[PDB]
Amino acid sequence: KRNYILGLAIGITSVGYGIIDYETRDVIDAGVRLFKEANVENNEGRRSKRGARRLKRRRRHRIQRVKKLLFDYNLLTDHSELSGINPYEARVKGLSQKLSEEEFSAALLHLAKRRGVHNVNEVEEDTGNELSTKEQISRNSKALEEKYVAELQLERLKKDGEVRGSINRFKTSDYVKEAKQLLKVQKAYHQLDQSFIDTYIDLLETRRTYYEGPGEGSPFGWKDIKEWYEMLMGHCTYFPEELRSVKYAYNADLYNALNDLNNLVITRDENEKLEYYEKFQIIENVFKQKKKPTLKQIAKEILVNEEDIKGYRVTSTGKPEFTNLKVYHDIKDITARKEIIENAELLDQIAKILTIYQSSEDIQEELTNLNSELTQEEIEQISNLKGYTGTHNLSLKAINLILDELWHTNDNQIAIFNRLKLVPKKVDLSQQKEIPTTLVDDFILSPVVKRSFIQSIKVINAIIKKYGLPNDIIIELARGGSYATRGLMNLLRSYFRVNNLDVKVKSINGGFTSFLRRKWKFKKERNKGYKHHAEDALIIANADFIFKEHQIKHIKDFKDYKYSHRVDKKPNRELINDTLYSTRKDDKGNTLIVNNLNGLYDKDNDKLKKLINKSPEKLLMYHHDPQTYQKLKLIMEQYGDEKNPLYKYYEETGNYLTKYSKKDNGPVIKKIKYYGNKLNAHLDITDDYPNSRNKVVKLSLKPYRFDVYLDNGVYKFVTVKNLDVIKKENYYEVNSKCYEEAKKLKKISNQAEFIASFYNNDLIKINGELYRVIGVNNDLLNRIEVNMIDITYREYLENMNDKRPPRIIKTIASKTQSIKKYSTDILGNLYEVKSKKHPQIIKKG
RNA sequence: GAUCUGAGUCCGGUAGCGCUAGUUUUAGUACUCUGGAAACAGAAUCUACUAAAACAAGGCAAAAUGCCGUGUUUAUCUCGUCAACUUGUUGGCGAGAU
DNA sequence: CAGATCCGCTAGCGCTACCGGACTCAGATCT
DNA sequence: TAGCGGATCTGA
Numbered sequence: 001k002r003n004y005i006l007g008l009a010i011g012i013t014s015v016g017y018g019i020i021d022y023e024t025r026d027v028i029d030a031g032v033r034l035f036k037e038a039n040v041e042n043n044e045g046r047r048s049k050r051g052a053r054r055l056k057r058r059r060r061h062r063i064q065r066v067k068k069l070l071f072d073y074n075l076l077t078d079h080s081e082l083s084g085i086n087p088y089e090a091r092v093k094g095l096s097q098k099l100s101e102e103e104f105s106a107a108l109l110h111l112a113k114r115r116g117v118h119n120v121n122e123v124e125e126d127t128g129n130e131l132s133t134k135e136q137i138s139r140n141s142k143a144l145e146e147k148y149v150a151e152l153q154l155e156r157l158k159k160d161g162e163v164r165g166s167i168n169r170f171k172t173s174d175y176v177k178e179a180k181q182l183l184k185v186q187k188a189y190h191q192l193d194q195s196f197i198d199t200y201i202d203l204l205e206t207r208r209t210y211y212e213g214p215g216e217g218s219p220f221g222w223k224d225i226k227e228w229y230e231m232l233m234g235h236c237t238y239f240p241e242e243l244r245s246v247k248y249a250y251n252a253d254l255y256n257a258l259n260d261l262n263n264l265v266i267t268r269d270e271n272e273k274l275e276y277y278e279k280f281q282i283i284e285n286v287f288k289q290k291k292k293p294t295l296k297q298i299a300k301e302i303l304v305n306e307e308d309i310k311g312y313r314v315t316s317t318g319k320p321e322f323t324n325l326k327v328y329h330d331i332k333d334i335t336a337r338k339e340i341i342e343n344a345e346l347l348d349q350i351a352k353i354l355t356i357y358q359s360s361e362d363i364q365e366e367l368t369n370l371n372s373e374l375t376q377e378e379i380e381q382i383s384n385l386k387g388y389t390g391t392h393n394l395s396l397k398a399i400n401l402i403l404d405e406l407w408h409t410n411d412n413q414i415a416i417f418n419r420l421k422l423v424p425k426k427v428d429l430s431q432q433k434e435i436p437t438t439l440v441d442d443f444i445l446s447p448v449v450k451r452s453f454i455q456s457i458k459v460i461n462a463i464i465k466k467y468g469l470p471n472d473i474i475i476e477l478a479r480g481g482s483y484a485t486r487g488l489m490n491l492l493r494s495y496f497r498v499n500n501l502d503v504k505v506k507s508i509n510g511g512f513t514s515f516l517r518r519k520w521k522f523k524k525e526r527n528k529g530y531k532h533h534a535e536d537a538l539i540i541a542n543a544d545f546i547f548k549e550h551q552i553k554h555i556k557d558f559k560d561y562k563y564s565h566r567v568d569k570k571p572n573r574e575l576i577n578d579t580l581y582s583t584r585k586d587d588k589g590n591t592l593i594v595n596n597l598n599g600l601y602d603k604d605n606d607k608l609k610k611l612i613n614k615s616p617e618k619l620l621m622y623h624h625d626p627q628t629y630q631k632l633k634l635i636m637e638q639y640g641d642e643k644n645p646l647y648k649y650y651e652e653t654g655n656y657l658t659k660y661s662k663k664d665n666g667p668v669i670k671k672i673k674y675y676g677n678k679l680n681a682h683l684d685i686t687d688d689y690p691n692s693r694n695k696v697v698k699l700s701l702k703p704y705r706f707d708v709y710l711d712n713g714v715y716k717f718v719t720v721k722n723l724d725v726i727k728k729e730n731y732y733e734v735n736s737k738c739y740e741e742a743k744k745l746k747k748i749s750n751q752a753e754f755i756a757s758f759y760n761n762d763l764i765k766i767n768g769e770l771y772r773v774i775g776v777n778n779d780l781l782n783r784i785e786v787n788m789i790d791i792t793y794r795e796y797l798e799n800m801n802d803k804r805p806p807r808i809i810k811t812i813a814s815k816t817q818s819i820k821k822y823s824t825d826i827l828g829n830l831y832e833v834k835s836k837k838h839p840q841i842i843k844k845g
Numbered sequence: 846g847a848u849c850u851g852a853g854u855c856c857g858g859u860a861g862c863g864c865u866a867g868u869u870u871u872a873g874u875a876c877u878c879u880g881g882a883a884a885c886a887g888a889a890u891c892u893a894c895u896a897a898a899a900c901a902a903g904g905c906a907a908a909a910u911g912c913c914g915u916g917u918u919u920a921u922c923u924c925g926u927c928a929a930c931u932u933g934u935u936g937g938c939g940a941g942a943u
Numbered sequence: 944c945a946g947a948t949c950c951g952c953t954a955g956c957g958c959t960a961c962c963g964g965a966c967t968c969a970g971a972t973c974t
Numbered sequence: 975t976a977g978c979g980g981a982t983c984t985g986a
Contacts, residue, residue, distance in 0.1 A: 038917085040858075041975080046916045047860075049901080053914080055863070056900080061911070068908080083872055087896070110896080117864045119958045133864065133956060162894055169865050210862045210959040217912045220860070232860085232961040237849075256851065263970050313969035315852060320969085323851070358960075389960080393850070412971035414849050437918085444963050446857075454918070483964065486847080567920060574915045575901055577952055580869040595951085625877050625891045659876070659892045666876060667893035677950090677981050688899045689870040693890090696869055698901080700952070700979050723902045727914080731934070762920085778980060785978075804947070811945080823920035831942050833921035841934040
């Protein structure tokens with residue numbers, strides 16, 4: 001309808017937008033789009049977890065396979081009990097002496113339990129004494145050439161009293177050697193075939209390789225290593241369809257050499273290009289003779305002085321180096337025969353196999369599959385070859401055409417490609433009115449910048465739909481430098497050009513932006529709010545106005561900012577905290593969680609003394625076996641003013657605090673249990689633990705959403721936890737039984753139906769005040785955590801400068817008058833919304 | 846100044862494979878009382894060590910052996926179409942609601 | 944009963960493949 | 975990775 005200049009202030013957590021009229025030169029509308037910062041830590045934690053689960057599942061499956069092996073030979077049965085057997089003593093006995101089949105099974109299962117590290121027996125480094133594994137097992141291996149793993153572990157068990165810890169890391173080769181000696185001794189007495197020993201040793205020593213990955217039933221798996229490398233490697237810079245060539249292919253190295261030789265500038269020829277018959281001679285007398293060509297040796301072939309040579313690439317003060325064909329010389333040494341050397345395609349295939357396949361056994365198999373001329377011995381020699389990794393940026397076909405052209409003409413690669421006329425094509429389809437959001441995914445960015453760009457693209461789409469095609473689009477960026485910015489503008493320019501509705505896209509300069517902000521008065525203070533980002537976008541468009549066209553600016557006084565917050569309705573997230581707590585019934589009859597008090601001998605840690613001063617009965621050692629408590633409390637009161645008597649007592653005696661003993665042999669105490677506050681909100685894990693005397697729970701269960709119900713005037717509130725959502729087929733469905741049960745506790749009438757359903761960062765209007773919901777604080781206490789939409793509560797309190805903690809909790813009780821649900825579009829327009837009836841299905845994909 | 850190419854260093858990712866640990870329970874041993882006027886273990890379950898087994902709730906798979914589960918996108922409603930393996934949720938157009 | 948105050952939340956390495964960026968150098972084309 | 979899930983505790 002009306003032309004305008006649109007400013008954008010892309011941040012990590014915010015995309016502020018500002019729309020300034022081209023004619024009146026004043027703001028039409030400005031707003032902010034708030035979203036939680038994308039963090040590499042989130043996905044790295046998810047992947048770290050996925051890997052830990054696979055590790056734990058792999059270990060359990062290996063234990064189960066070992067158990068099946070023991071069953072098939074009747075060594076271990078369901079009637080036998082591993083319990084009561086010390087596996088360390090059993091292993092040390094088995095290395096030299098016969099042992100029973102149940103104790104044999106105990107030793108074998110313990111060996112299969114801990115296998116040792118494989119990454120270190122390949123590469124091990126040692127520097128004195130350190131908290132590293134590569135050095136710890138260095139020291140252990142020093143202690144191993146004398147004795148096996150089990151004997152050293154048992155010796156440590158007698159010396160320090162314990163085996164487990166950082167001291168207990170060893171190599172898989174040591175474990176395999178010990179197990180092999182154990183099995184060699186044991187196979188005489190027991191009925192064990194050779195095949196059983198090899199099967200067990202594979203179970204002990206076998207792990208997946210990094211190129212083999214999970215089972216191909218996984219979404220993360222791959223059928224073959226060739227396909228694994230195919231999806232891994234990039235695509236050609238000119239031919240998107242074509243995959244990159246491996247950088248040590250013979251044609252790629254020839255291409256690089258030809259490129260170098262064309263950069264050569266010779267004066268005696270009075271021309272800048274080198275001759276063809278001369279370049280071929282150089283390449284056939286220097287590059288094919290030396291592993292690394294030398295410019296001085298090139299001077300001999302060119303028959304001209306070195307200072308006449310110019311244009312060679314050089315790195316700092318080093319010699320002028322040229323790109324050399326390592327594959328050609330490597331094949332040349334192992335194979336003197338010239339049919340392999342002559343056939344460049346053979347070197348290309350050999351280099352591709354060497355780069356693709358990570359194992360030497362795989363390389364030999366695929367070299368045999370090549371059915372080439374050279375005999376199997378040279379196949380083994382190539383298999384032993386190493387140093388081939390990475391990919392050349394160009395594809396093999398592009399390299400072939402380019403080198404065929406480079407043999408004759410001395411033009412650089414860009415000129416040859418321009419004469420080859422490959423014209424870039426814009427990836428956007430243009431058949432969608434909105435900017436495609438897939439382009440941001442296409443570009444490689446930091447996760448924070450990628451999410452900010454997606455939000456910015458949707459903001460641009462909404463503005464174009466609401467107001468019309470911008471006259472100009474103007475962008476800033478907080479993170480990513482100017483590189484990500486230029487990618488965003490390449491996207492936007494490509495879309496506008498291909499769709500023929502071209503709009504200028506410009507990024508105002510950071511120095512010029514600072515100059516503009518310094519001009520006049522734009523005060524920046526702490527606790528400004530998101531209106532700060534909105535004002536920055538307005539100032540960005542303001543900067544553009546100065547460049548192309550400051551009196552009576554509406555930017556000075558504009559209390560019309562609209563704040564849009566992203567709503568997170570994504571199911572299946574972190575359900576519950578990973579810590580497992582033990583509970584204990586008190587005298588009264590309430591279930592109390594048990595908390596351990598760690599770091600007793602720490603100067604900074606003074607909790608143990610506070611817990612004694614508050615109430616000593618909270619300590620479990622006061623109630624049970626009180627004499628060590630009385631000794632500890634004598635130590636406690638003796639120091640008094642000292643903040644942590646435990647560390648001081650240990651320092652004076654030289655040893656940590658030990659539990660009371662008349663023989664003075666009592667064990668040292670590292671942690672102390674005390675009684676915690678009673679818990680109502682918990683998840684029972686006690687079923688996992690048979691015959692558990694006391695109930696063991698996980699805590700802090702995360703809510704998904706809460707539905708506000710209204711019966712007979714009083715407002716109710718039902719919480720749907722992340723544990724109540726379960727996945728089937730392609731979708732997520734909340735549990736009907738769990739929802740009905742949770743409705744029973746809140747005792748909502750059957751005739752009542754709910755006002756609305758609230759997800760995280762959803763707008764709610766309680767008693768005429770509108771805040772966005774953070775989450776339900778207490779399900780039983782009927783309180784929900786909220787936050788102010790325009791400014792975060794912490795910043796508002798900091799301006800308010802009060803003592804009260806920055807946290808607002810609202811109670812949905814019998815006294816609240818109204819509850820309303822509001823939604824804002826991405827632009828920030830706020831709407832009262834109508835609710836559906838009881839959402840129990842959410843789609844995935 | 847910005848694309849392209851290739852020599853390096855230095856950071857950041859995405860996936861994969863493993864290591865030792867951590868929380869908890871059970872069992873055993875130590876240690877704590879008790880008969881003990883003797884043998885024996887009755888309690889206590891606090892403090893350590895060792896083992897096995899459970900670690901986001903769970904869901905698949907059949908053991909001819911293995912896989913998934915903590916991220917990425919997402920304002921709400923009606924409207925006639927079109928899938929989903931045919932009821933309520935989702936591809937797309939319209940329309941409301943500040 | 945309504946805020947305020949108090950209190951916890953798994954962890955270190957150790958490799959691998961391929962993708963990206965900044966830099967600095969030697970030369971291409973575009974603006 | 976500093977916000978979230980909660981329990982206590984004073985007013986009473």
